[PDB]
Each structure stands twice: as C-alpha cells, then as structure tokens.
C-alpha cells in the first residue's frame, strides 16, 4: 500500500 508506513 503506497500510503502506508514506508519507514
């Protein structure tokens, strides 16, 4: 999911 936590 592009707008989930990318960290």
């Amino acid at each position, epitope marked *: 999911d*592009p*707008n*989930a*936590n*990318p*960290n």
Partner: antibody, heavy 129, light 107 residues
Framework: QVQLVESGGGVVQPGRSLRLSCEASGFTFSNFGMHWVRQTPVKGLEWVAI????????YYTDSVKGRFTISRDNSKNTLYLQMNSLRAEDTAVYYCARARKGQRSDYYGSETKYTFDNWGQGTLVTVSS | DIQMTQSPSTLSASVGDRVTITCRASQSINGWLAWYQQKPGKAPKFLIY???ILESGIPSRFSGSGSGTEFTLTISSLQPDDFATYYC????????FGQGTKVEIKR
C-alpha cells in the same frame, strides 16, 4: 536538525538523462521513507515517486513510469532520482521529502495514512537544448 | 485519481482579518487532508495534517476543519508573514495537491 539538500539540476537536452542527489542529515536516513516532489510553474505541485526505508518498494506517478528511477544508498544518506528520456513536461523544481505519519505519533488505528514533510529547498531542472 | 480543488485562487485581506480557504476533494478521502504553506523563495512548509492537527511550532492563529470531502484552512488574525500560497494535499490514495490559494495582504 533535519536538513535535506538537493543537487544535480541544470539544462538537459530534450530526451537525455540526468541524476539528482538528495543528501540527508539530522536523522537516521535508513529509518525513513523518502519522496520526490516537483513544482511546475503552471500545473503546480506534483508527486513523482516514493521509496521505502530499505529500498524494497518503489512507487511512481504514471507520467514518469518507464523514465524515472528512485533509489537510495542508506550507507551514504543519499536519495537518488535517475531521470531518463526527459520531456518538456519535466522542467520543474524537484524537492526531496521525508515520509511523515499523517497523524500524531501516539495514534494507532486500522487505516494510518502517511504523507511527506521536511522538504528541502529544491533543485531546478530546465529541459532545453 | 483524486482531484483536489481550492477556492479562491487569489485572496486579498488586511492584517488582523479572518481568512478562510476551502478545499474540495473529488471523492471521500476520510480525514487525510494536509495543508502546506509556500512563502516566496521557500519550499512548501508542513502546516496542518488530518485536516485539523497543527504541526509543532505552527502559530495558534492557524486552524483547520473538514466535513468528509470539503476542508478549510483558517487564519484568525492575518499577519504580514502569512503572505504565501497555501496548498491542500490528500494522502489517502497516493499524494495529490490543489492549485493553491495566494493570500495577498492589503495595506
């Protein structure tokens, strides 16, 4: 403090290649996701690409797919945007931004969306022969 | 995609006046609306997230509200340094911005 610095802008012949470099300082670059944003004089602000903290996943906007590649060197605290097959629509000021939780840090919910803050000053790319 | 629409595109007002900017979403983005402020020569600055939560260090004169698809940024007392262009961004499905609203100051 948190400081993102962009570099690599100038002229590119229409239909050539250019690499941008975003330097990071003040935080653990290998812990945060990163974004590339651009601002055009007329069309305004436009998201370009996102990369995960480890570089596992990369998502792009449609207009740059097959032309741009977002990458990172977590050992150098440097973000990269390899721009290939540059068009006239690519003339813009390109910022790099750090990923940001679109809600207070104590929050824990089902749908927790993320945005990007801590924008650098930017690097202006002008596509001209 | 999700299209964001801001109104008006240019606004004039005096110091100490209340200023409100509206932001329309093409569909329901829940409360995932962010407001950015771009002053001349500077990059956009994170102001409000979740349509109402002010960022740390943002003056108390700024505020935000939302009702599903319509969101507003409000300056209770407009100040000289508040001259800027304010963009609203949704971070629900990808990240898209509005055209911006320039708040010029009448003196």
């Amino acid at each position: 403090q948190v400081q993102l610095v962009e570099s690599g802008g100038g002229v590119v012949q229409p239909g050539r290649s250019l690499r941008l470099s975003c330097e990071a300082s003040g935080f653990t670059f290998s812990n945060f996701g990163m974004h590339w944003v651009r601002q055009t004089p007329v069309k305004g602000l436009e998201w370009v690409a996102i990369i995960w903290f480890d570089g596992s996943y990369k998502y792009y906007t449609d207009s740059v797919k097959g032309r741009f590649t977002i990458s990172r060197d977590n050992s150098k605290n440097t973000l990269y945007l390899q721009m290939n097959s540059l068009r006239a629509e690519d003339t813009a000021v390109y910022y790099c931004a750090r990923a940001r939780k679109g809600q207070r840090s104590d929050y824990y919910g089902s749908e927790t969306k993320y945005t990007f803050d801590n924008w650098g000053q930017g690097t202006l790319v002008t596509v001209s022969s | 995609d999700i299209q964001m629409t801001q109104s008006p595109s240019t606004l004039s007002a005096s110091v100490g006046d209340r200023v409100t900017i509206t932001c329309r979403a093409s569909q329901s983005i829940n409360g995932w609306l962010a407001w950015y402020q771009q002053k001349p020569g500077k990059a956009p600055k994170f102001l409000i997230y979740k349509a109402s939560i002010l960022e740390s260090g943002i003056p108390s004169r700024f505020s935000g509200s939302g009702s599903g698809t319509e969101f507003t940024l409000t300056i209770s007392s407009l100040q000289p340094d508040d001259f800027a262009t304010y963009y609203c961004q949704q971070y629900s499905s990808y990240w898209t911005f509005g055209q911006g609203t320039k708040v010029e100051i009448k003196r």
